[PDB]
Design a protein around this nucleic acid. Structure first.
Lengths: 219, 203, 214, 101, 102, 48
RNA sequence: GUGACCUGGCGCACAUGGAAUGACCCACCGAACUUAAGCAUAUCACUCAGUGGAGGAACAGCAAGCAACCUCGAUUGCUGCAGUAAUGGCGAAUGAACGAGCAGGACCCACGGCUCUUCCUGAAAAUGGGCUU
RNA sequence: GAGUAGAGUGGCUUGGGACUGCAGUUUGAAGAGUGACGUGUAUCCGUCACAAGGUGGCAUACAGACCUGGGACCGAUAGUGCACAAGU
RNA sequence: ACCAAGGAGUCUAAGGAGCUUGCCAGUCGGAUGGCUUCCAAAACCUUGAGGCGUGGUGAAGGCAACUAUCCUUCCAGAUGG
RNA sequence: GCUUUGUGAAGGGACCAGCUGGCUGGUUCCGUGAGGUGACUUCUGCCCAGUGCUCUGAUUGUCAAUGCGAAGAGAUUCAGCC
């Protein structure tokens, strides 16, 4: 079809993608990218000015490990803290947590103690970096708040905490040089891998073997 | 409670009690018209759980849909073109009879808003459904917040647009996840979104 | 936007599509063709043509570096057409006090005292109404390019030097090659201030001098 | 088609419905590219001595370790899989392979 | 390339973490038996009776033919699981009948 | 747009007035919850 | 003693609906030219045409979901996965999704991502109602 | 949350393949559980969610028509069919 | 028949083989994010997942490139001692 | 003019996407729906093997879906009858 060696076309444009006189087309041109960048920036700062004396994002999100085996080690932000993390931090009212700016996610649970401790200490450094304004402007004033934290409410751009990925990018940091352990000298890791893989394959066989053994025991 | 007992009575539909009652009701539906205004919902429990109230803003309408598949309206059964599209008789509608019934009642009562419907009866010739409609310009409706959302101009002809429960059913929206892959936000919206040729400024 | 059909053979005309209907001049006339009057062009211009161009950042930065080196070599500033009659040195460096300039009169005083107002005056004199159908599409004038003032930050010198015809403004934080080498031509007069000059290689992340053949 | 694309026109192999690729993702490195990943201060202070530096391959994005390339001094390698050649070379150099999630 | 086979972490028994025991939530009360609802349903069964296919199942279980009753329930419900459950229900109903009779 | 439009032309000119106001500046309601009372008691004292 | 309900009707009053709209949207219906160097399944295309209904957006939407992980946590849009898995006279061709990165997660919506019904309570939520003022 | 989910069968649809979804018809559950876990079935176990009711802003689309800012566009056989008393 | 004006290898997705340029076991990253009367939807920046490459082979289960002073061998062969 | 033909109405023919729909039919065998031949006159012979149509019990053969039975852990498989 080419009179050459070029690959098989595989073009995938058989269905009126082209805006001609007869067709409307299946084309979307993103010429708005440039203007929309500035527009998004402007509406983001309008969001800030609207919810001013608060984080521009606003809810504290938890840190969860990315899902699959490929992204196990990469951490990221979640949707909200588990009620166990809230109770461990000291918050037993999800609606109050939300009103003071901690995000809740009752769908999530802690499948391990590491996530629990990590997000608990996250909430605990929150609620200490946090200056609550009092309702009605002149009643009770909480601890730590010094009566000029209310005079100087500063809107930070990013939430104090490090980057979300900087929690897996710290667990992925090897130790210092060390001595070997005698089990690390005797252990055959490839033999272990092959053994634990042959294990899942020899199951029914490792039942028929027992059955034959006990039949011959009878006989 | 009373509605639980009603629900289980109506769950055992082949029982002799429910057969007797449904047979009398089928007879009187056949001797009524094709769209009748009910004075009160048959299946009080069902209408209550679908969102009926005995306030003056709600109305119940019964409607029949003739059983069977769809025959395509080609003169003398002559479908030109190719053998695939040359089928006439063994076709089946995309909508289901519940939403067809809702559509008929909503087109007949144009100034009302169609919330849920429910199967009430079925005989050899027809299936009978009851449709709950709400008068959006009634003070009770406009006052009660729980139904107040029906009075907004976006809620006109949900039966016509497939927003009701039967519509969500035949649009594939019963399931989500991997069993409603090409369903949301719409089948045609999805098709457009993944048949789109996107030309960025730099490619 | 026509219902034009071809008449076919057996009629003594060409086989182009022709306007259907009658009773007007347009009837029977050829339609649907680049060759026809009132018919579509050949390959109508589409809006999803590639308009933009992609250059790697390394190459753009190298272009900036080279444009600056050529600005430093003065046998190219004059080649591009600047008057180095009163220019004491190349590159031209200027005290940071000019970044606090508020008046175009003080900007021209500085430019005179340093020897670039000759270029500014050349541009102002040779400013003309653009030749050839560019003046119809909102590009009224053809203005030449004079000195380029590169400041260290956002300051008042922008409003100072703004009205002066040929002068352009720029900052070391973001050096525009469309200003360092306009037209693709190289060797433009740049009048860096002192801190901009001191931050040039820090911004451009230049650590060494290159060993170039001679 | 015969001359420029032989294996066209056919069907071969077990077809796998819902082919997950994240549980099959496994970038591999080699023993030749290990000692580059150790700050040579450790490589120097551990040369003849008993301590061995630790190489965490997941930090750099490698899951399996392949055993091509000679090794100069024993190091401890944490990874998600190893070839038996890689295990053999590391064990002989002195270090140890470690299976890490 | 990059997608070579790899054993799973808990098959290699690595356990980069320490698991927390899956707790009890209010949602898995939906599993526990519902005595009041079962009372309601047994009352309604007492009142309205059984479907024709349920009666045929009871009449098969009377003569024995429990496999035939299972096949009938399978044809009616589609699933072997549902068929086993319905045959269990009908066996228990028949036992209630015989007990009430004797 | 091919006829008199003897009502839609008026509603479109009204929409145009609104649009070329909002292009100048976003809208600001003259009376809101925070000034109703002040305006009303000012009016009261001024007319009394 | 000449009623009380139920179910239907006629008239009146107060109101909605109706029709329109070269862009976008929702529900249906629905081709063929074309491609396969023929052609019939396939393709064009779940498109054009046709019907109905809108809104400033519509639709979707806080899991009877993804995944099999050190799990995640509404939906939507983009990047990418990916021309891959898979479908296909396994021919012409067709062809996703999740992970992951973002925008969003202020606002004229919210019980600040839920709630109706189920379930609990319950003398209709309590000093009659109406027309003018 | 029942003529529902599911199943037999027919037809459309999908990459979804012993059938992704939908629809007719016959059938039709459990709720001392159910659905999904991409090869039909039976047997065990596990994970996730809680359908058959409803609201729900944001990021999103926008060739019309109105209000604007622009353009490496066309320049009266061009650009809209119409630069004009042109859908005349 | 004659003259004038118009009039036909174009843009796009993917790709092939040369050529140019930059970087190098990396490279690119204008999805998006930071800035600053119009110009500017530009320019600048490395927050960047990821694309391609670093490993291939098997239908798959899967497995995965010897060589401890250095160096695969042979024939032709560019330089150089 | 002749001659076949279907039809006694829940029928013949027949439209319609659909319809408790409209048509023949305001009809009822001296009526009619479907063919052929072509006034009068004189005749219209033989062939039911082929194809077509039609009748029977279609009592013997083949023959669908559903239903009923058996075996299987089940998907499923097998038999007989209408």
């Amino acid at each position: 079809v080419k009179k050459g060696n070029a690959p098989v076309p595989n073009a995938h444009f058989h269905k009126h993608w082209n805006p001609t006189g007869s067709q409307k087309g299946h084309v979307r041109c993103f010429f708005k990218q440039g203007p929309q960048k500035k527009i998004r920036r402007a509406r983001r700062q309008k969001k800030a000015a609207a919810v001013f004396p608060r984080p521009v994002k606003g809810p504290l999100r938890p840190i969860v490990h990315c899902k699959s085996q490929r992204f196990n080690m990469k951490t990221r932000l979640g949707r909200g803290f588990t009620t166990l993390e809230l109770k461990t931090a000291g918050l037993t009212d999800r609606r109050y947590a939300r009103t003071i700016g901690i995000s809740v996610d009752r769908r999530r649970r802690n499948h391990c103690e590491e996530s629990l401790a990590l997000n608990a200490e996250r909430i605990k450094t929150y609620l200490s970096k946090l200056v609550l304004f009092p309702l009605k402007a002149g009643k009770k004033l909480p601890e730590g708040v010094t009566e000029e934290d209310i005079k100087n409410p500063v809107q930070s751009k990013q939430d104090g905490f490090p980057k979300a990925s900087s929690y897996g990018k710290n667990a992925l940091k090897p130790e210092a040089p060390r001595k070997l352990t005698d089990q690390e000298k005797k252990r055959l890791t490839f033999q272990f891998l092959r053994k634990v893989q042959r294990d899942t394959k020899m199951v029914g066989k490792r039942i028929k073997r027992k059955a034959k053994k006990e039949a011959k025991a009878a006989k | 409670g009373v509605y639980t007992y009603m629900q289980f009575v109506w769950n055992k539909k082949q029982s002799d009690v429910m057969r007797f009652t449904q047979r009398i009701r089928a007879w009187e539906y056949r001797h009524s018209h094709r769209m009748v205004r009910l004075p009160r919902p048959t299946r009080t429990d069902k209408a209550r759980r679908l969102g009926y109230k005995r306030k003056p803003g709600y109305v119940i309408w019964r409607v029949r849909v003739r059983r069977g598949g769809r025959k395509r309206p080609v003169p003398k059964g002559i479908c030109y073109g190719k053998p695939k599209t040359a089928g006439v008789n063994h076709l089946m509608n995309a909508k289901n009879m519940r939403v067809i019934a809702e559509g008929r009642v909503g087109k007949h009562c144009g100034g009302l808003r169609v919330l849920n419907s429910y199967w009430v009866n079925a005989d050899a010739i027809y299936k009978y459904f009851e449709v709950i409609l709400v008068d959006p310009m009634h003070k009770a409706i406009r006052s009660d917040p729980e139904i107040n959302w029906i009075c907004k101009p976006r809620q006109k002809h949900r039966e016509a647009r497939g927003v009701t429960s039967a519509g969500r059913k035949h649009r594939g929206l019963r399931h989500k996840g991997h069993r409603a892959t090409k369903a949301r936000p719409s089948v045609r919206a999805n098709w457009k979104r993944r048949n789109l040729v996107k030309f960025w400024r730099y490619r | 936007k026509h219902s034009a059909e071809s008449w076919g053979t057996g009629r003594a005309v060409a086989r182009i599509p022709r306007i259907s209907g009658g009773g007007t001049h347009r009837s029977g006339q050829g339609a649907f063709g680049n060759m026809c009057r009132g018919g579509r062009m050949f390959a109508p211009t589409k809006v999803f043509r590639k308009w933009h161009a992609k250059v790697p950042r390394k190459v753009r930065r190298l272009a900036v570096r080279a444009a600056l080196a050529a600005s430093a070599i003065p046998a190219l500033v004059m080649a591009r057409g600047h008057n180095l009659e009163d220019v004491p040195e190349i590159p031209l460096v200027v005290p940071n006090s000019v970044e606090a300039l508020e008046k175009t009169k003080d900007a021209v005083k500085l430019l005179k005292d340093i020897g670039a107002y000759h270029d500014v005056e050349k541009v102002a004199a040779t400013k003309k109404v653009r030749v050839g159908k560019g003046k119809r599409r909102n590009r009224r004038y053809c203005v030449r390019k004079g000195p380029l003032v590169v400041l260290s930050k956002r300051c008042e010198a922008q409003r100072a030097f703004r009205n002066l015809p040929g002068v352009d403004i720029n900052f070391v934080s973001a050096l525009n090659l469309l200003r360092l080498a306009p037209g693709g031509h190289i060797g433009r007069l740049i009048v860096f201030t002192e801190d901009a000059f001191n931050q040039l290689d820090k911004v451009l992340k230049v650590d060494t001098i290159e060993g170039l053949p001679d | 088609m015969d001359k420029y694309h032989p294996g066209y026109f056919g069907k071969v192999g077990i077809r796998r419905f819902h082919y997950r690729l994240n549980p099959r993702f496994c970038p591999t490195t080699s023993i030749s590219r290990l000692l580059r990943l150790v700050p040579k201060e450790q490589l120097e202070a551990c040369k003849g001595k008993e301590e061995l530096p630790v190489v965490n391959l997941l930090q750099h994005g490698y899951f399996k370790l392949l055993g091509t390339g000679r090794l100069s001094q024993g190091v401890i390698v944490k990874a998600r899989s190893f070839s038996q050649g890689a295990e053999r070379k590391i064990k002989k150099a002195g270090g140890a392979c470690i299976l890490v999630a | 390339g990059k997608f070579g086979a790899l054993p799973s972490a808990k098959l290699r028994r690595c356990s980069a973490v320490t698991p927390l025991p899956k707790p009890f939530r209010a949602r898995d009360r939906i599993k526990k038996p519902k005595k009041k609802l079962r009372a309601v349903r047994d009352l309604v069964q007492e009142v309205v009776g059984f479907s024709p296919y349920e009666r045929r199942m009871i009449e098969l279980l009377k003569v024995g033919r429990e496999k035939r009753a299972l096949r009938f329930a399978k044809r009616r419900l589609g699933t072997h699981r549902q068929a086993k459950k319905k045959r269990d229900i009908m066996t228990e109903v028949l036992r209630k009948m015989r007990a009430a009779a004797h | 747009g091919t006829g008199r439009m003897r009502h839609m032309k008026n509603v479109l000119k009204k929409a145009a007035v609104r649009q070329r106001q909002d292009q100048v500046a976003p809208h600001q309601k003259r009376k809101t919850a925070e000034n109703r009372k002040k305006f009303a008691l000012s009016r009261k004292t001024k007319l009394a």
